[PDB]
Amino acid sequence: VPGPITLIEPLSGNTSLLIKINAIHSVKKSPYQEIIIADTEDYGRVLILDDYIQSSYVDEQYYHESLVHPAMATHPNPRDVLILGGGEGATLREALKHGTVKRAVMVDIDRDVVELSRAYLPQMHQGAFDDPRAKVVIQDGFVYVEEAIKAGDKYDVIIMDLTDPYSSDIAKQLYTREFFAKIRRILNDDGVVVTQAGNSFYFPAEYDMVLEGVKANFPIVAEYEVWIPSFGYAVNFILGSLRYDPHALTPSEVDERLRARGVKTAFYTGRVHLALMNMPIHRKLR
Amino acid sequence: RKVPGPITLIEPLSGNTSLLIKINAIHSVKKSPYQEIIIADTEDYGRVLILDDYIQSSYVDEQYYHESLVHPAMATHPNPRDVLILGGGEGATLREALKHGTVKRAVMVDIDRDVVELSRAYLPQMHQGAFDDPRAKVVIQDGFVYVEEAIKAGDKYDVIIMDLTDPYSSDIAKQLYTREFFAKIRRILNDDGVVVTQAGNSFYFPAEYDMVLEGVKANFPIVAEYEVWIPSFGYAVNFILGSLRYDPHALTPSEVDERLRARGVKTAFYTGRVHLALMNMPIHRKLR
Amino acid sequence: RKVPGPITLIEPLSGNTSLLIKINAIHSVKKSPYQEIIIADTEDYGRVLILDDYIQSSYVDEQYYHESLVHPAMATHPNPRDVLILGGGEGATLREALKHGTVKRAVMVDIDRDVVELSRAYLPQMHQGAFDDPRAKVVIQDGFVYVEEAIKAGDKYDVIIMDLTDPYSSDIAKQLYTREFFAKIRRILNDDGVVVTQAGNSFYFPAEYDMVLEGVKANFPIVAEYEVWIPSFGYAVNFILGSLRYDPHALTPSEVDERLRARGVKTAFYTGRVHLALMNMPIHRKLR
Amino acid sequence: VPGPITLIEPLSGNTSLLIKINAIHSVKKSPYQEIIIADTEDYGRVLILDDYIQSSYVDEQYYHESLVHPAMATHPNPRDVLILGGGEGATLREALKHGTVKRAVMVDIDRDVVELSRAYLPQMHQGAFDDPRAKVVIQDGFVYVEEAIKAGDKYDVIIMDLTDPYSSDIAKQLYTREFFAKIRRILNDDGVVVTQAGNSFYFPAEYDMVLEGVKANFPIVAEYEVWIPSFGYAVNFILGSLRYDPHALTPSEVDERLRARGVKTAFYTGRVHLALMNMPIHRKLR
Ligand SMILES: CSC[C@H]1O[C@@H](n2cnc3c(N)ncnc32)[C@H](O)[C@@H]1O
Ligand SMILES: CSC[C@H]1O[C@@H](n2cnc3c(N)ncnc32)[C@H](O)[C@@H]1O
Ligand SMILES: CSC[C@H]1O[C@@H](n2cnc3c(N)ncnc32)[C@H](O)[C@@H]1O
Ligand SMILES: CSC[C@H]1O[C@@H](n2cnc3c(N)ncnc32)[C@H](O)[C@@H]1O
């Protein structure tokens, strides 16, 4: 039974997790959110924002590989990547593994998250912030996208790695139908977007809202989920595509693209892709 | 609500993580000779059965568990006529197995009369009358003793489903998870038979998981491992399917759907595509 | 057992501290128009009444609360004949007041019919038949409205006991804790009357405590502050006694005991020596 | 509602406290017990041993003044004081306030507690460890008392400030009938002993055992309790005396002795003494 020091992680409002804490490395009230970096017995080091674990050493690769690789592998040649959120740098780490990437931009609203990750989460970023192909921008992603439309910027793959649509004030504007219309305006004609969408089991209304938003703007939409122990649930992802269909990729094609591009993974493979594409998402059944 | 309440179940998960679950009502508390039983209503999961603090089953998500436990095995077997279930006290496992039109005889063996009785009374959406199907026999006995007696009698089954309390926590079930017990299971299977068991959780309890896996592998030439997230448990349950002849990996979605249709099996979750996903998704392990 | 369970009440205490209390059974859950009511059995405290997550009363320790609330005031008054109780939904306050042989009329006013009804049914050791004493009248009404109507009618009482939900948490009771309300209380007291109220907790909620204290002091020349540890609440409840003539500080143990004897008052806790202790023990404050 | 980081403090087994933690200053697994020093929102800095708060900045004075002053004030001239336990040094701090004290010995089994208190709990010891009248001995108090009998050592006042009789393995031998017989052998003829005895409400059996032990060995016994918010209960104290009766002290006599000896307190006064002597201890009433 966990203790004596414990994190109470909110899950649904009607369920929470109690997680044994071994140490607290940092506590910072930023202008945007409360940040904690801590060591947990079960999950090793974690980043916590407003009481929610964002990432853990023992299971973050399940999250970041699931977020990034299906989209990157679906695109036959992703050269320009935009990441909204991803403050710990693991999303950037995964995207930069694709040898085809020439430019990766990461936009986070909160300098404190990026700085504390640089210092305390080395196994997450793994030097990605200093890759010559990477640019880290501190800005509200809403404003950044407006400015990119004005400039006529274009990306192959846009990855949204934000705080949750069911809980997060600072990210709420990025989950609307209107924002996805803007995302489409900064994609190439064969581009792909992927976002995490919370959890369809515990937060179906918020999930459905994000889904409707993506569907209104993209002809091809894939929904898939992965269990992340440290979150207490299976995260839902939504992949929106303008041309290429993730459902049409075979295990062999996935593995060949990963190999050709020099992508090493702890989890994601062609067989995983097939499973993600075929497993329906969880809903309350009664 | 950061802390669910005011009335809360503290469900152990790993020892280093637990779940706090809002309770709306308690319908029954019974200290049986074997274990502490609670039936309660939860806000998130509806009605639950709890044994020794662990949720065994919930109204909102039990179909994910019982369909995942039962159908891959039953669908792998081309003609399962005789089914044995060890555990399954709430009757949902029996419910799922009886859906296969080919089944002529289903035996369910649970050590604890109180679980079966309280389920009859309080969990109608789980058993759905399965206890009273003319094809079904409910036996109250330790499954270890029952299997020894079946060897003596020379009993044989097509499909054996083990739906017990967890291998990492449950004293009453520990003997049923050994290499030696799986040798006994093999002795009461037909030559083309299949066994399936839940094996706890490979992420939080890898040692206990590996022990069950080694046990199955020592006794069965074909072994499939698959997992499914069950919200009310707080983790993805691991299942281990052991087969003497037929390979679940060889089934196509179309073949699965055709067998389900032919046998009159209606499901809320399991389909040919789900089968494919289960067969191709690797199980979770701590990665660092 | 580091974590009490499996079923647990999470009782808020300060916001920065809460109590986790093992629950054995839930006898009733009722969402009334005013508040959420639970009656439950706890391992440590026996049966409890819970309103909006806060234990109001427990079988094992309620006598410490009700005797401390009622008897100092009743014993201070040389001849209390007419008693008004605001709140006191479980009937234990009424029980204690009626023990004084001098009492001819006791009125108990609670806003919430559901509390009184569920107490009648499930908390017999609290009311102990007090609701049906010929000297007692139970009125269902907001205490604010009742006091306004009593002013209009020119009603007068010897002792007014306020036994409400907390001043730091309770919306329904907030109007009864103001300077202005205590001015109204004074208008329905005889010239030598006394009021007593619980005032939350001066350690965890000093601001709310000080506000109630200032309110009483503005209206009453004699004010005594005392506290008693109530295990089931997680803190020492603060009481404030306001008096128009008679000083509780002037009572000797022997005089208290003589008045209790003369009036036929039997207690489990309160005595003359307890009175002396209550009058001399300073209340708790955060010291750093 | 407390969080996100929380201490789960055991109370009875059937009740525990959840306490918001702001920071952890130190975690040490000593040979004897697990030690944590932390900042709590409600109670400020705390020392925790095996999950139980031993002392908090906001309420420790209620505990230490209640433990020390009734006994010291009962004795007309306490010159030699022995303290068993008291690892944070607050007991020593309170005892040294009496101008009559010439020698105060503090005996704790655990060097780590004393060291971590020196470093992290300055408001508790307040330099008491380095008072010329003080001697700090690291030793099991059972062994120390046996050695004192052999040497024929004598004290005026013995204060036992140990971990709880209902939970603590390392202290169990010091709470027996036989140990109180030994305590009597190292007291002068007019000496006094005082000990905390856990809690008579939640742990009546353990309480009664300590009480029976004291009663078998001392003709005058006083029982009193004080609510300590950070513990979640009213601590019970038991004062054993060979000659002088704490019940016979008037408030004025208490105040005169405090004044004469130069004792300044935040809580204890003559009126408090009278209250402590007259308030019965709590028991489950049903
Ligand atoms: C830790 S990964 C999630 C990241 O998303 C960031 N985030 C939240 N809202 C926004 C926004 N509107 N624009 C950019 N980044 C955001 C948070 O600061 C966090 O670092
Ligand atoms: C609720 S489904 C799990 C069931 O397994 C049952 N069980 C546990 N151990 C054994 C055993 N050795 N034999 C049969 N049933 C068991 C428990 O009684 C429970 O009903
Ligand atoms: C449990 S005893 C405390 C009682 O105070 C009652 N109460 C709260 N606010 C008011 C009010 N304004 N008037 C009368 N009773 C009240 C609650 O219904 C509860 O029964
Ligand atoms: C913090 S005050 C309580 C102290 O009692 C000390 N203690 C516990 N058992 C013994 C013992 N047998 N002898 C001396 N000190 C002890 C502990 O190390 C702790 O520091």
In this structure, the residue with its CA closest to atom 2 of ligand 3 is C88
Query: Residue C153, exposed/middle/buried by CB under 10 A (0-12, 13-18, 19+)?
Result: exposed
- Using CA atoms, how far apart are residues A204 and A206, in angstroms rounded to an integer? 6
The 10 Å Cβ neighbour count of residue A28 is 14
- Work out whether strand B189-198 and strand B235-243 pair parallel, antiparallel, or are unpaired: antiparallel
SS3 D178: helix
The answer to whether the bond into A4 is cis (omega within 30° of 0) is yes
Beta bridge mates, C20: C10, D16
Method: X-ray
Residue A98, marked binder: no
Q: What is the least distance, in Å, from the CA of A280 to any CA of chain B?
A: 7
**Which residues have CB under 8 Å from B169's CB, separation 6+?**
B12, B52, B54
Query: Six-digit token pair at C43?
Result: 């391992």
Q: What angle do CA C92, C215, C11 make, to 5 degrees?
A: 45
Q: What angle do CA A89, A94, A98 make, to 5 degrees?
A: 135
Catalytic pick from B61, B82, B114, B163? B163
- Using CA atoms, how far apart are residues D175 and D165, in angstroms rounded to an integer? 7
Query: Six-digit token pair at B234?
Result: 């707080």
The 10 Å Cβ neighbour count of residue C84 is 28
- Using CA atoms, how far apart are residues C3 and D14, in angstroms rounded to an integer? 8
The minimum-distance atom of ligand 3 relative to the CA of C176 is 12
Q: What is the least distance, in Å, from the CA of D187 to any CA of chain A?
A: 39
Q: Which residue has the tokens 């004074």?
A: C186
What does the DSSP 8-state code read for residue A245?
-
Query: Six-digit token pair at B27?
Result: 């319908």
The set of long-range contacts for C32-39, using a CB threshold of 8 Å and a minimum separation of 24, is C32/C112, C32/C113, C32/C114, C32/C115, C33/C112, C34/C111, C34/C112, C34/C114, C34/C172, C35/C112, C35/C115, C35/C165, C35/C172, C36/B6, C37/C112, C37/C114, C37/C115, C37/C118, C38/B6, C38/B7, C39/C118, C39/C122, C39/C123
Q: How far is CA A280 from the centre of its chain?
A: 20
Query: Six-digit token pair at B250?
Result: 């060889």
Q: Which amino acid is at B199?
A: A
CA distances from C142 to B126, C147, C164, C174 (A): 47, 9, 11, 12
The minimum-distance atom of ligand 2 relative to the CA of B87 is 5
**Which residues have CB under 8 Å from C97's CB, separation 6+?**
C70, C74, C83, C85, C103, C106, C159, C161
CA distances from B51 to B29, B38, C248 (A): 10, 7, 55
Nearest partner of B89 among B106, B108, B70, judged by Cα = B108
- Using CA atoms, how far apart are residues A91 and A83, in angstroms rounded to an integer? 8
Q: Ligand 4 pocket check: which of D114, D159, D170, D231 to mutate, most ligand atoms within 8 Å of Cβ?
A: D170
Query: Six-digit token pair at A182?
Result: 């803007």
Nearest partner of A99 among A258, A234, A214, A235, judged by Cα = A258
The minimum-distance atom of ligand 2 relative to the CA of B109 is 14
CB contact under 8 A, A4 and C2: yes
Q: Is the dihedral of CA B273, B276, B280, B286 positive or negative?
A: positive
How much distance in Å is there from the Cα of D127 to the middle of ligand 3?
51
Which secondary-structure segment (H or E) carries D195?
A: strand D187-196
Strand order in the sheet with A103-108: A134-138, A103-108, A80-85, A155-161, A187-196, A233-241, A220-228
Query: Residue A102, exposed/middle/buried by CB under 10 A (0-12, 13-18, 19+)?
Result: exposed
- Using CA atoms, how far apart are residues A57 and A60, in angstroms rounded to an integer? 6
Beta bridge mates, B225: B240
Q: What angle do CA A274, A280, A284 make, to 5 degrees?
A: 155
CA distances from D200 to A151, A186, B26, B253, D171 (A): 75, 71, 32, 68, 18
Catalytic pick from C52, C163, C171, C210? C163
- Using CA atoms, how far apart are residues B123 and A20, in angstroms rounded to an integer? 34
What does the DSSP 8-state code read for residue C167?
T
Nearest partner of B203 among B232, B224, B176, B229, judged by Cα = B229
Q: Which residue has the tokens 């918001």?
A: D20
CA distances from B288 to A56, C236, D117 (A): 10, 48, 36
Q: Is the dihedral of CA C61, C66, C67, C69 positive or negative?
A: positive
Q: Are A159 and A81 a contacting pair, CB within 8 Å?
A: yes
SS3 A136: strand
CB contact under 8 A, D13 and C4: yes
Which secondary-structure segment (H or E) carries C229?
A: strand C222-230
Closest-CA residue of chain D to C46:
D286
- Using CA atoms, how far apart are residues A20 and D7, in angstroms rounded to an integer? 10
**Which residues have CB under 8 Å from B199's CB, separation 6+?**
B167, B177, B208, B209, B212, B213, B238, B239, B240
Q: What angle do CA B135, B139, B142 make, to 5 degrees?
A: 145
How much distance in Å is there from the Cα of D275 to the middle of ligand 2?
58
- Using CA atoms, how far apart are residues D71 and C8, in angstroms rounded to an integer? 41
Q: Which residue has the tokens 């540890």?
A: C229
Q: Are D135 and D112 a contacting pair, CB within 8 Å?
A: no
- Using CA atoms, how far apart are residues A280 and A257, in angstroms rounded to an integer? 25
Q: Are A99 and A262 a contacting pair, CB within 8 Å?
A: yes
Measured between beta carbons, which residues in chain C are less than 8 angstroms from residue B5? 9-10, 53
The set of long-range contacts for A213-220, using a CB threshold of 8 Å and a minimum separation of 24, is A213/A175, A213/A176, A213/A177, A213/A179, A213/A180, A214/A180, A214/A238, A214/A240, A216/A177, A216/A180, A216/A181, A217/A177, A217/A180, A217/A181, A217/A183, A217/A184, A218/A180, A218/A184, A218/A193, A218/A242, A220/A244, A220/A245, A220/A246
What are phi and psi for residue B9, nearest 5 degrees?
-95, 135
- Using CA atoms, how far apart are residues D198 and D191, in angstroms rounded to an integer? 23
**Which residues have CB under 8 Å from A198's CB, separation 6+?**
A164, A165, A166, A206, A207, A210, A235, A236
CA distances from D37 to A37, B133, D88 (A): 19, 62, 11
Query: Six-digit token pair at D100?
Result: 């009559």
Q: Are D218 and D240 a contacting pair, CB within 8 Å?
A: yes
- DSSP letters for D96-111: TTSTT-SEEEEEES-H
Full 3-state SS string of A160-222: EECCCCCCCCCCHHHHCHHHHHHHHHCEEEEEEEEEECCCCCCCHHHHHHHHHHHHCCCCEEE
- Helix boundaries (H) for B179-283: 179-187, 206-217, 253-262, 272-280
What does the DSSP 8-state code read for residue B283?
P
- Using CA atoms, how far apart are residues B163 and B198, in angstroms rounded to an integer? 6
Chains that touch D (3 or more CB pairs under 8 A): A, B, C
The 10 Å Cβ neighbour count of residue B282 is 14
- Using CA atoms, how far apart are residues A48 and A28, in angstroms rounded to an integer? 11
Q: Are C65 and C90 a contacting pair, CB within 8 Å?
A: no
Q: Is the dihedral of CA D205, D210, D215, D217 positive or negative?
A: positive
CA distances from A67 to A94, A158, A236, C4 (A): 9, 11, 9, 39
Q: Are D49 and D35 a contacting pair, CB within 8 Å?
A: yes
- Using CA atoms, how far apart are residues C209 and B97, in angstroms rounded to an integer? 64
Nearest partner of A91 among A283, A237, A278, A243, judged by Cα = A237
- Using CA atoms, how far apart are residues C274 and D281, in angstroms rounded to an integer? 11
**Which residues have CB under 8 Å from B145's CB, separation 6+?**
none
Full 3-state SS string of C58-113: ECCCHHHHHHHHHHHHHHHCCCCCEEEEEECCCCHHHHHHHCCCCCCEEEEEECCH
The answer to whether the bond into D4 is cis (omega within 30° of 0) is yes
Domain ranges of chain C: 1-56, 57-245
Beta bridge mates, D98: none
How much distance in Å is there from the Cα of C152 to the middle of ligand 3?
22
Beta bridge mates, B238: B227
SS3 B233: helix
B45-71 CB burial, b ≥16 within 10 A, e <16: bbbbbbbbbbbbbbbbbbbbbbbbbbb
Query: Six-digit token pair at A157?
Result: 């793959």
Q: Are B171 and B33 a contacting pair, CB within 8 Å?
A: no
- Using CA atoms, how far apart are residues B82 and A125, in angstroms rounded to an integer? 55
Q: Which residue has the tokens 């201490």?
A: D7
SS3 A241: strand
Whether residue A108 has its Cβ less than 6 Å from ligand 1: yes
Q: Are C94 and C131 a contacting pair, CB within 8 Å?
A: yes
Q: Are D30 and A25 a contacting pair, CB within 8 Å?
A: no
- Using CA atoms, how far apart are residues B91 and B115, in angstroms rounded to an integer? 10
Nearest partner of A22 among A10, A11, A38, A33, judged by Cα = A38
What are phi and psi for residue A246, nearest 5 degrees?
-65, -25
Query: Six-digit token pair at A14?
Result: 């009607």
Query: Six-digit token pair at D9?
Result: 């403090």
Q: Which amino acid is at A98?
A: H
In angstroms, what is the C-alpha Rg of chain D? 18
CB contact under 8 A, B10 and C6: yes
Q: Are C66 and C145 a contacting pair, CB within 8 Å?
A: no
Nearest partner of D242 among D173, D199, D186, judged by Cα = D186
- Using CA atoms, how far apart are residues D228 and D233, in angstroms rounded to an integer? 6
